[PDB]
Amino acid sequence: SPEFEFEEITLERGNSGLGFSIAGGTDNPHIGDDPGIFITKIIPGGAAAEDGRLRVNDCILRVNEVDVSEVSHSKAVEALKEAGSIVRLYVRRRRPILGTSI
């Protein structure tokens, strides 16, 4: 910050899981060598969509009490799957700043 904002979002797992897809990790970093776990898709009607807070391009930093800021993709996937039925996600989002260069 102020470039980013941070948010905690709790989801109750449903029959369609948490309702989103992720990409990234230390083994498959994005440009700039960013190992972050990023939301790439939110499915209609799933927990994330119904809660309405999560957005595509959000970066998941923590799942319950598991740090996922620097982990492999598979570990992130495991962290989310083993988090159980109530999942607390700590996320980072780029702050929309209406700035002007001087």
Q: How big is the chain by its Cα radius of gyration, in Å? A: 14
CB atoms within 10 A of CB 81: 13
Helix/strand/coil percent split, the chain, to 5? 15, 40, 45
Kind of pairing between the strands at 20-24 and 37-42: antiparallel
Distance CA 61, CA 51 (A): 19
- What resolution in angstrom units was achieved for this structure? 1.7
Phi first, then psi: what are they for 35, rounded to 5°? -85, 5
User: Residue 21's beta-bridge partner residues?
Assistant: 41
Distance CA 33, CA 55 (A): 22
Closest by Cα among 16, 80, 79 to 50: 16
Three-class DSSP category at 25:
coil
Sorted by where each begins, the domain ranges of the chain are 1-102
Please state which CATH number belongs to domain 1-102.
2.30.42.10
Burial, 82: exposed, middle or buried (Cβ in 10 Å; 0-12, 13-18, 19+)? exposed
- The method of structure determination was X-ray
DSSP 14: B
